[PDB]
Design a protein around this ligand. Structure first.
Ligand SMILES: COc1c(C)cc(N2C[C@@H](O)[C@@H](O)C2=O)cc1/C=C/c1ccc(Cl)cc1
Length: 192
């Protein structure tokens, strides 16, 4: 599972509008973090520096095989925790390791069924990704899509807003699936 004892990601989907097409969706083996340093900014606030501060158990890699065979572009996600917190979520989109978008959002805890849930429902997909998907979709071969996506990564850092503690850091890498197989993901622990 993707989480610590303090915070867990229970669901994530990126979609375009049953009547929904999921590009990627989440409803453990380990990888050496130094093998993916280059995929993210190596200067201040990079993966190496984040991993240096720790804690090591908060670091995950997700590989997505996206369904690009298909409106409103949206994202939904749910985190959970047993302690009431305010979350700061920083997403960085990187192209050839260079940061091209950073988005910072705040999410407040909602008490629900004995636990705290941090829910985004039908949130607008960020403009950079919408425009990228519009172009990626036109490609005639899956292998060409994979060539374009091998340089595309996303780093997501979730911190406790009030303490500045890192709660969860996830690196995302992308390939394309077939429409027959549909979307898939695998989650890995980042170790050093
Ligand atoms: C998993 O990485 C993401 C993370 C961490 C976050 C947001 N989010 C959250 C909000 O900021 C919203 O604006 C947004 O786009 C989107 C993605 C990815 C979107 C996507 C869609 C299709 C394909 Cl093939 C690949 C990726």
């Amino acid at each position: 599972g993707l989480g610590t004892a303090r915070l867990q990601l229970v669901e994530f989907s990126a979609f375009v509008e049953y009547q929904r097409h999921l590009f990627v969706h989440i409803s453990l083996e380990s990888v050496d973090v130094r093998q993916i340093y280059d995929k993210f900014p190596e200067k201040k606030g990079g993966l190496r520096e984040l991993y240096d501060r720790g804690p090591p158990h908060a670091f995950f890699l997700v590989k997505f095989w996206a369904d690009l065979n298909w409106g409103f572009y949206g994202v939904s996600s749910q985190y959970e925790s047993l302690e009431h917190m305010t979350l700061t979520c920083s997403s960085k989109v990187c192209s050839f390791g260079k940061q091209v978008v950073e988005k910072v959002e705040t999410e407040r805890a909602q008490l629900e069924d004995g636990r705290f849930v941090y829910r985004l429902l039908r949130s607008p997909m960020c403009e950079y990704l919408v425009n990228f998907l519009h172009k990626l979709r036109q490609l005639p071969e899956r292998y060409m899509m994979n060539s374009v996506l091998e340089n595309f990564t996303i780093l997501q850092v979730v911190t406790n807003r009030d303490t500045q503690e890192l709660l969860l850091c996830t690196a995302y890498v992308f390939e394309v699936s077939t429409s027959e197989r549909g979307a898939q993901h695998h989650i890995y622990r980042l170790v050093r």
